[PDB]
Design a protein around this ligand. Structure first.
Ligand SMILES: CCCCCCCCCCCCCC(=O)OC[C@H](COP(=O)(O)OCCNC(=O)CN(CCN(CCN(CC(=O)O)CC(=O)O)CC(=O)O)CC(=O)O)OC(=O)CCCCCCCCCCCCC
Ligand SMILES: *[C@@H]1O[C@H](CO)[C@@H](O[C@@H]2O[C@H](CO)[C@@H](O[C@H]3O[C@H](CO)[C@@H](O)[C@H](O)[C@@H]3O)[C@H](O)[C@H]2NC(C)=O)[C@H](O)[C@H]1NC(C)=O
Ligand SMILES: *[C@@H]1O[C@H](CO)[C@@H](O[C@@H]2O[C@H](CO)[C@@H](O)[C@H](O)[C@H]2NC(C)=O)[C@H](O)[C@H]1NC(C)=O
Ligand SMILES: CC(=O)N[C@@H]1[C@@H](O)[C@H](O)[C@@H](CO)O[C@H]1O
Ligand SMILES: [Lu+3]
Length: 549
């Protein structure tokens, strides 16, 4: 039932094949036989595909593949056998695939990679994925013998029972390593074998409650690891302190991420010499999202965090119930340039403490995108302490109507007031602004003169009339999609003399011929500026299609 195209891209995906389709050719460059029922693959099912570059056999129900089944596929660069029923992996399968770049074997019920090295002859491999949720249980020294460089290696071993020493050490260059571990029993050991190879390490679903640090036998303590990421992990204050002791080896680590993690406040370490601040070495960026902190008893030290974040330049802590960032804590974040506190519980009174006198000196960008702020004037007043602030985002906050006069930090040139519920716009908004976003609100008109405005986002409001062009002399980008606009005054866009991009879609354009003449001609003379397609209200055809006598 195949359906191929001019360039050899054939599609047999999700048919109902019970065996590879008969009579394939050497013209096919890609064959997608996913979601089928190919239970067995024999000696002569892919013989005639000498030019095949892509073979996708994901989620079929393959449980048997003859040893020389891929023998004549020397031009194969992408092989995906994921989510099948392969209980065993044969080394003869990969013998004739020296040109293979991507190999996905994950999702198969095998217990190990076998007794024979499967990839020694895959000189050009770049991406390898192996493992599964409950069967894969052993990793051996012969498993990756031969591989020297890999862009991406993913190992799913949530049921791991044993890891041999140095199994990972033979590989010298791994740009991205993703390990799915359920327990930490072998983590320490695995670290010993990846510290001189892994650039980006990613741990998934790991319970690190009982993780303990212990000296490692590095060769020169020069780890090329730049990004460390924990996702869906469980930690304790005790095991957390053990984890940061590992930083002493990754002298170059610049980004640490914690996604959907849990921090059980139990244990509560006390040993002094077993704290090791080390100023988190060279951590430049810290990102925390959806951190769940069960039973946050009373007051913790917090001082065992000041000296730790002294050199961090970017911090993000979103959707983690943050309601207060103590002043003395902010005063120690001397290098913080970017702070993102989106989706938390901040309110004026506590922001006032978080943004005290010497708080976040040198902070350039602040994001308070979805908290419990109620007053624009009060917020602006509180942020006057941040002398270096140039970008402020306070979108998705329910504000009371803004006054006519406000005080904002001196260098503020970016202000995001999106999804803020405002119905009017007033001079509280400073003339210094370059970028302003008041999209997704309840505006009926815009009359603010912003001489330096370069970008206006006013999409998703109720403007019936377009803003006067003289209001933005050097405007580069204007977004005014989804806005009840029916027409524009003749010649208005030629007056936006520096305009580069404009969004006009989703507006009930009155395509009556006399009236729509200007708008139509301008769009035909400026298609490179329009993003999306302004359509006629009623019919639905593109406004640029109209041609009036
Ligand atoms: C950078 C960050 C640094 C964090 C510094 C905190 C130190 C000590 C604080 C102790 C602490 O409680 O911390 C835990 C937070 C978890 O918070 P929770 O989930 O448990 O509890 C929600 C509570 N919510 C609010 O308070 C809501 N605010 C209004 C304030 N209300 C106050 C009374 N609450 C408090 C209480 O009962 O205790 C009353 C109550 O709710 O009953 C006063 C009022 O409105 O009357 C507005 C609103 O929504 O109406 O952990 C982190 O943020 C961890 C992030 C780590 C980042 C590492 C980063 C390296
Ligand atoms: C002003 O603030 C706006 C609202 O906070 C912001 O819009 C939001 O932009 C983010 C990132 O571009 C979007 O992210 C979400 O959606 C993407 C795509 O589905 C997901 O991959 C993300 O995980 C996340 O869920 C928001 O959807 C978007 N909200 C909307 C629709 O307004 C503006 O970009 C800000 N304006 C400026 C000038 O920066
Ligand atoms: C962040 O803003 C502060 C403003 O206070 C800058 O630090 C001040 O710099 C002036 C130089 O004009 C000194 O006279 C002050 O003594 C400094 N304030 C103090 C006491 O810290 C700071 O340079 C800005 N950060 C950067 C590097 O952009
Ligand atoms: C370890 C080693 O000797 N390299 C082997 C090579 O002998 C063999 O011929 C090839 C299969 O094509 O796989 C690789
Ligand atoms: Lu509260």
């Amino acid at each position: 039932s195949l359906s191929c195209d001019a360039s050899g891209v054939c599609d047999g995906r999700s048919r109902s094949f019970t065996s590879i389709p008969s009579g394939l050719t050497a013209a096919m460059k890609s064959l997608d036989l996913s979601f089928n029922k190919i239970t067995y693959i024999g000696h002569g099912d892919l013989r005639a595909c000498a030019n095949l570059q892509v073979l996708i056999l994901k989620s079929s129900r393959i449980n048997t593949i003859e040893g020389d089944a891929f023998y004549s596929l020397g031009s194969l660069e992408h092989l995906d056998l994921s989510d099948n029923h392969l209980s065993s992996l044969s080394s003869s399968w990969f013998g004739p695939l020296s040109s293979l770049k991507y190999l996905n074997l994950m999702g198969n019920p095998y217990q190990t990679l076998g007794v024979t090295s499967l990839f020694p002859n895959l000189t050009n491999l770049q991406t390898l994925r192996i493992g599964n949720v409950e069967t894969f249980s052993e990793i051996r020294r012969i498993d990756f013998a031969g591989l020297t460089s890999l862009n991406e290696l993913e190992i799913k071993a949530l049921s791991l029972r044993n890891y041999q020493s140095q199994s990972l050490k033979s590989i010298r260059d791994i740009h991205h390593l993703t390990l799915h571990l359920s327990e930490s029993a072998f983590l320490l050991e695995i670290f010993a074998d990846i510290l001189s190879s892994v650039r980006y390490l990613e741990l998934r679903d790991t319970n690190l409650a009982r993780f303990q640090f212990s000296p490692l036998p590095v060769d020169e303590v020069s780890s090329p690891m730049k990004k460390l990421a924990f996702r869906g992990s469980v930690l304790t204050d005790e095991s957390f302190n053990e984890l940061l002791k590992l930083l002493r080896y990754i002298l170059e680590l610049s980004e640490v991420e914690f996604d959907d993690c849990t921090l059980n406040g139990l244990g509560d370490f006390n040993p002094s010499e077993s704290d090791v601040v080390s100023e988190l070495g060279k951590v430049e960026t810290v990102t925390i999202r959806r951190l769940h902190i069960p039973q946050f008893y009373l007051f913790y030290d917090l001082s065992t965090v000041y000296s730790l974040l002294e050199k961090v330049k970017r911090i993000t802590v979103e959707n983690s119930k943050v309601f207060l960032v103590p002043c003395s804590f902010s005063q120690h974040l001397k290098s913080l340039e970017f702070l993102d506190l989106s989706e938390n519980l901040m309110v004026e009174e506590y922001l006032k403490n978080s943004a005290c006198k010497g708080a976040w000196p040198s902070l350039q960008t602040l994001v308070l995108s979805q908290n419990h702020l109620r007053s624009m004037q009060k917020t602006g007043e509180i942020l006057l302490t941040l002398k270096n602030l140039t970008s402020l985002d306070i979108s998705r906050n329910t504000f009371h109507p803004m006054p006519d006069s406000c005080q904002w930090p001196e260098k503020m040139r970016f202000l995001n007031l999106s999804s803020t519920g405002i119905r009017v716009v007033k001079t509280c908004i400073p003339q210094t602004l370059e970028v302003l976003d008041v999209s997704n609100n309840n505006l009926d008109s815009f009359s603010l003169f912003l001489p330096r405005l370069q970008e206006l986002y006013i999409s998703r409001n109720k403007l019936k009339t377009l803003p006067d062009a003289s209001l933005f002399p050097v405007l580069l980008v204007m977004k005014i999609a989804s806005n009840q606009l029916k027409s524009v005054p003749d010649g208005i866009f030629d007056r936006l003399t520096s305009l580069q991009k404009i969004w006009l879609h989703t507006n009930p354009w009155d395509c009556s011929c006399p009236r729509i003449d200007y708008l139509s001609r301008w769009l035909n003379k400026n298609s490179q500026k329009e993003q999306g397609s302004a359509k006629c209200s009623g019919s639905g055809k593109p406004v640029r299609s109209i041609i009036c006598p």
